């Protein structure tokens, strides 16, 4: 019978000059339904991490699964690109750095690839944003700073800026993201806002899911109230735990409901 | 045949010259084992409320006899004293205040005659409280201030301190509660009182879209910073009853938890 | 300052004879923009409970402004008809017995009198029906005779049949839950008929400790066995409020997700 | 490496009755190594049909559950054991009973059970062990509740092999197969049957445990959980009963964990 499946491929890219393995997550009437089109979730990983862990470890097969059987969540293509590894040897982080400029990857050869190879309908409505730790905060700019192109974000334990709780070699790859993440920080570029970029952000539906152990509560708290001052409508949910898979997994249970009712 | 039971009566305290009404949730084992004690969790309404809403509104009776009968709470004794009413007519609050000295009354008055008329076992590691709004700000500094009478705390929606007429009660209890700030009372805490903070257990829930958010994120905040363990929930919601009464569904198990 | 409303009426049905209270939850935008239609929502009610009791007890007006504010419903108008009331003096029960022609009121007076004057949408893609105890059964017979009329059916701890003085108004009603079992109507269906119910979304839920658990689980039983899609919750819980309280929390987003 | 941490561990214990070795995958409490006296409850958590020991831990997660429901108190400290008790069906001997040629209930109850409580230091009574498993491990879980209810406290059956299901049972028809001895023994010990033929005496046993039963809506065992649940229910056994949604799979059982460890919790 037909089935929901999980494949792993590659992609080269001349921006980055580096082949790009990502993981995407295939509805189960794709191969029976050859003319449908779907809404796609971009699904982002956090440091250290590589594109198979949203369907390792976060288990999403099995949850879509669950939540297109009962209705909660409609079909839709979901993938991860690799933006990750070990952090001494391979670039990790999502916006365009000195040397590495996966934010213009990500934008003119990625996207393209995917929502051409895999049927996304290709339009603003359906298409949203999540991810966790690092991936949160790339989610987060991404959705900010490209609101013409998502519905949605829905922000896990997200890398909003730096905690404040150093690498010896200020040019070393974790350096250089670091300076990046604290020039993007999610919660600057609300604090800043103007009344015509809250208009752009208010266009966009948030969630901000972040546990009251976790190191990186304290900037999603400000991030949320920069929100709610600003007057941009933002959900935010503290539920008990920390920086971990438990976490990320059963936020997929309030993420997969949530970027359904939003392209709908 | 046996059922729990809810009971309202008054209690006159010399302390405050004032009749004062509660409310007590009673067991379904209570008329049945006239010789058992329980617990009790004291459980505290919220600024112009008073006694009745707990029962009424927060449905404790309904939300009990489900979790008792699936081993989730205890068999317990629950309590809500009068601390309110129409503000600009009522005193309103639970520490003490110039010609209304209502801690007193709660220690000296209320309770021991509660824990003796309703069978509550009377020690530390069976006492418990908690509260919404101002009462969540009286549970707070009360277990702060009488670490030695309560084994664990539920703050709902609490006021920490004031979110950002002085003959008035409004005015009296405004300044009572920047007096007690729950926030101020862990920020400046020596060692000794850290050790003695860590020997409550706590927890505190205040919705996403509640305006006293703020507070309840500085005393959490203050708390963790401070090594004293503390459970922390934001969950949807504003400053409402949903919000209240969906709260004991995470309270009756965690204080039947943390008693002994 | 818009806000939702709970408001209780009065229509008169000349199919019964009687006048007929309601009561019907507005949403904030209500009054904003008077052009705005909606989708709806039937709300019954059980045995000897009247109109009013799903505002007063179900709160629904509380947990729809939760849910409407998070998106996890949408703005629908909900109505709940009286169909009961002392089983001994009054009239209980939703479809057309001797002497008390109630489905007749219901669709042919009821019905178009409410959509008409509250601004609903109008087509079976925007209105649903839902229910407690009768009124689950109510629902659910309902949707399978009327399937060109509902997109959608949640049916609370529902009476799909009875679980196991000749001209009293309870035998009436007993009788004709018998006549029309719910259950009954699933395991007699014919080819066309399972192809008529499939296009109903059904959601089941009943408690592990209701004296109705049998009957619903034979629902669901011959539900699944006839390849008609439906979800079935059994959660902790018996025949009480806490129970159809909380299942307005998973009633109301389903409605919204199969509304078109 | 500064600090301590809860631990799985898979180790084998050699079994004289079964002549086998079998291995077992163990959760110890992140306090065992840093509080040599510390005595624990302990949950043998079993797995289904086809699976092995380690399942529990790879693909339940049980480590990370246990690490957050220890830290909020809803969990106690416990250890936590899966005995193998499975393989490929053709070429692997599956099931919890004493079967002809297989005396997994005898290894249990007088070899596993001894050496595990005494290496891993569990208090070692009745009321601090408990029961829990999936598919057949749920109904290997229910009947050792039964049969052994001077052993256990609490019991916490998943999507449970209650009795053999009307539809769905896997093809035995060689009754020399370990297969076809497997589904003779299920049938012989039905959870269902068990409850059903109970005497009074039998009934006051069972109700000295505590009994939880979850089964989702599209499960091909639901039927045979329900006909359990009433047998329990109409004899006055006090049981708790859910169905939630889904069905015979793992986001049923990983999810299932967050209901069993605090119920075990309380009852111990
Ligand atoms: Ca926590
Ligand atoms: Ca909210
Ligand atoms: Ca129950
Ligand atoms: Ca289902």
Not at 85 to 96: K, P, R, S, T, V
Not at 199 to 212: M, P, Q
Not at 219 to 232: L, S
């Given at each position: 019978?037909?089935?929901?499946?999980?494949?792993?491929?590659?992609?080269?890219?001349?921006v980055?000059?580096?082949?790009?393995?990502?993981?995407?997550?295939?509805?189960?009437?794709?191969?029976?339904n050859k003319?449908?089109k779907?809404?796609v979730?971009?699904?982002?990983?956090?440091?250290?991490?590589?594109?198979?862990?949203?369907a390792?470890?976060?288990?999403?097969?099995?949850?879509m699964?669950?939540?297109?059987?009962?209705?909660?969540?409609?079909?839709?293509?979901?993938?991860?690109?690799?933006a990750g590894?070990?952090?001494?040897?391979?670039?990790?982080?999502?916006?365009?750095?000195p040397?590495?400029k996966?934010?213009?990857?990500?934008?003119?050869?990625?996207?393209?690839?995917?929502?051409?190879?895999y049927?996304?309908?290709?339009?603003?409505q359906?298409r949203?944003?999540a991810?966790?730790?690092?991936?949160?905060?790339g989610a987060?700019?991404?959705?900010?700073?490209?609101?013409?192109?998502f519905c949605?974000v829905?922000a896990?334990?997200a890398?909003?800026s730096?905690?404040?709780?150093?690498?010896d070699?200020?040019?070393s790859?974790?350096?250089?993201?670091?300076?990046?993440?604290?020039?993007?920080?999610?919660?600057?570029?609300?604090?800043?806002?103007?009344?015509?970029?809250k208009?752009?952000?208010?266009?966009?539906?948030?969630?901000?899911?972040?546990?009251?152990d976790?190191?990186?509560?304290d900037?999603?708290?400000?991030?949320?109230?920069?929100?709610?001052?600003?007057?941009?409508p933002?959900?935010?949910?503290?539920?008990?735990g920390?920086?971990?898979?438990?976490?990320?997994?059963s936020?997929?249970?309030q993420?997969?409901?949530?970027?359904?009712?939003?392209?709908?």
């Open positions: 019978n037909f089935q929901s499946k999980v494949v792993t491929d590659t992609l080269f890219s001349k980055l000059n580096s082949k790009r393995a990502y993981t995407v997550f295939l509805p189960k009437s794709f191969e029976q003319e449908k779907y809404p979730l971009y699904l982002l990983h956090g440091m250290w991490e590589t594109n198979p862990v949203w390792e470890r976060g288990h999403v097969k099995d949850v699964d669950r939540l297109v059987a009962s209705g909660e969540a409609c079909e839709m293509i979901i993938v991860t690109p690799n590894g070990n952090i001494h040897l391979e670039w990790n982080g999502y916006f365009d750095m040397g590495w996966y934010e213009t990857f990500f934008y003119t050869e990625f996207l393209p690839y995917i929502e051409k190879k049927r996304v309908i290709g339009d603003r359906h949203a944003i991810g966790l730790s690092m991936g949160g905060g987060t700019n991404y959705g900010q700073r490209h609101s013409d192109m949605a829905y896990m334990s890398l909003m730096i905690p404040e709780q150093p690498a070699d200020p040019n790859k974790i350096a250089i993201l670091t300076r990046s993440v604290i020039e993007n920080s999610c919660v600057k570029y609300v604090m800043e806002a103007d009344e015509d970029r208009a752009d952000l208010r266009s966009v539906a948030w969630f901000v899911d972040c546990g009251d976790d190191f990186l509560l900037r999603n708290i400000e991030f949320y109230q920069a929100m709610r001052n600003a007057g941009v933002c959900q935010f949910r503290v539920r008990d920390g920086h971990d898979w438990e976490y990320w997994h936020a997929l249970y993420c997969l409901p949530f970027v359904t009712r939003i392209f709908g």
